[PDB]
Amino acid sequence: DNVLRIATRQSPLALWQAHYVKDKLMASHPGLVVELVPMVTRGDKGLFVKELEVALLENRADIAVHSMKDVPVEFPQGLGLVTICEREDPRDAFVSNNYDSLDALPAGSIVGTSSLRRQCQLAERRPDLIIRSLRGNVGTRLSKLDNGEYDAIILAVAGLKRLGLESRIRAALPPEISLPAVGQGAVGIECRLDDSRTRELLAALNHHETALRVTAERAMNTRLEGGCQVPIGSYAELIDGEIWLRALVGAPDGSQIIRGERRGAPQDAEQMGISLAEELLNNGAREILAEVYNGDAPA
């Protein structure tokens, strides 16, 4: 019917991604009418995705736009991820007003982040730092830093660039120092699998290479039954024709961090991620994840 409705959250970053996807759709289909259907979410697991899926199941919208790391590992029947857009810088960022790097932070400094993934890696290297929870939209996060509530905070490089706040990035951390969350930097689109018309329209937005990388990352997480908030790092790169997948699972306090890696052909992306996950599980990840999930442990 030439009309496409986009379901999205109401934060500045969520609306940015909605426009980004709209612009792409318009560029490849100049006669389409695009409508934004703003929602709200519990996050405002899968607290920040559920209302959007409901919108899709009862035909209130046609597609839902998410940041790949927020997309849940399991989907209600009839729904699924069908498009993965070009990946932006996938690195974590060091944001601070008073210090230029993590090394310069004196013992006792307060670093803010609610991510167990960012936390376990920070505690492993610097046991002297105090890691405190931090929640809210990027804008309120930056406010609490500015109000002297935190000495430094950790945020994704992609979020800040997208919002035109690149100047806040004191330092982009290498993946070797802070392994990214699965799909960090990529936008993914979910819709009703049987909606051939919508899916046909989406094809031009899919970025092959990014889809390959993210597939390896997600298969790893799906096996670990991971979710947006667990001490899990999962990051893949396309190096000389092969995918190089790295993963880690760590105790929040940094005492124990289990690491592993895989290298192989693009078409083996899913099996690779599942294999790496099982290697971590049989190496202690299971015990750590069971303490995090508390009882519920991966198969």
Residues carrying an active site annotation: 70
Q: Which is nearer to ligand DPM, 69 or 223 (CB)?
A: 69
Contact 154, 94 (CB under 8 A): yes
- What is d(CA 113, CA 154) in angstroms, rounded to the nearest whole number? 6
Q: Could you say whether residue 158 binds ligand DPM (CB under 6 A)?
A: yes
Q: Could you say whether residue 257 binds ligand DPM (CB under 6 A)?
A: no
Size of the site for ligand DPM (CB under 6 A): 19
Q: Side chain identity at 154, as an amino acid letter?
A: I
Scan residues 211-240 and list those touching ligand DPM (CB under 6 A). Answer: 228-229
Q: Could you say whether residue 248 binds ligand DPM (CB under 6 A)?
A: no
Q: Which is nearer to ligand DPM, 201 or 232 (CB)?
A: 232
Going by C-alpha positions, the residue among 178, 184, 182, 170 that lies closest to residue 122 is: 178
User: Where in 17-175 does DSSP place strands (E)?
Assistant: 33-38, 63-67, 79-84, 92-96, 110-112, 130-132, 152-156, 171-172
Q: Which is nearer to ligand DPM, 229 or 256 (CB)?
A: 229
Q: Could you say whether residue 134 binds ligand DPM (CB under 6 A)?
A: yes
Residue nearest ligand DPM by beta-carbon distance? 228
Burial of 155 (0-12, 13-18, 19+ CB in 10 A): buried
One DSSP character per residue, 230-250 reads SSEEEEEEEETTEEEEEEEEE
Q: Could you say whether residue 67 binds ligand DPM (CB under 6 A)?
A: yes
Segment lying near ligand DPM (by CB under 6 A), choices 51-59, 63-71, 239-247, 273-281: 63-71
Pick from 69, 223, 246, 286 the residue near ligand DPM by CB under 6 A.
69
- What are the tokens at 8? 């999205």
Scan residues 79-118 and list those touching ligand DPM (CB under 6 A). Answer: 113-115, 117-118
Enumerate the β-bridge partners of residue 190. Answer: 64, 81
Scan residues 167-206 and list those touching ligand DPM (CB under 6 A). Answer: 181, 184-185
- What is d(CA 187, CA 185) in angstroms, rounded to the nearest whole number? 7
Q: Minimum distance from CB of 85 to ligand DPM (Å)?
A: 11
Q: Which is nearer to ligand DPM, 187 or 202 (CB)?
A: 187
Exposure of 109 in the CB half-sphere (CA atoms within 13 A): 20
Burial of 256 (0-12, 13-18, 19+ CB in 10 A): middle
Q: Which is nearer to ligand DPM, 118 or 213 (CB)?
A: 118
Segment lying near ligand DPM (by CB under 6 A), choices 64-72, 102-110, 199-207, 218-226: 64-72
Q: Could you say whether residue 159 binds ligand DPM (CB under 6 A)?
A: yes
Q: Which is nearer to ligand DPM, 66 or 192 (CB)?
A: 66
Segment lying near ligand DPM (by CB under 6 A), choices 50-58, 67-75, 208-216, 282-290: 67-75
Pick from 55, 84, 155, 245 the residue near ligand DPM by CB under 6 A.
155
Sign of the alpha-carbon torsion through 21, 23, 24, 29: positive
Angstrom CA distances, 164 to 12, 52, 292, stand at 11, 26, 35
Helix (H, G, I), strand (E, B) or coil at 253: coil
Residues that bind ligand DPM (CB under 6 A): 13, 67, 69-70, 113-115, 117-118, 134, 155-156, 158-159, 181, 184-185, 228-229
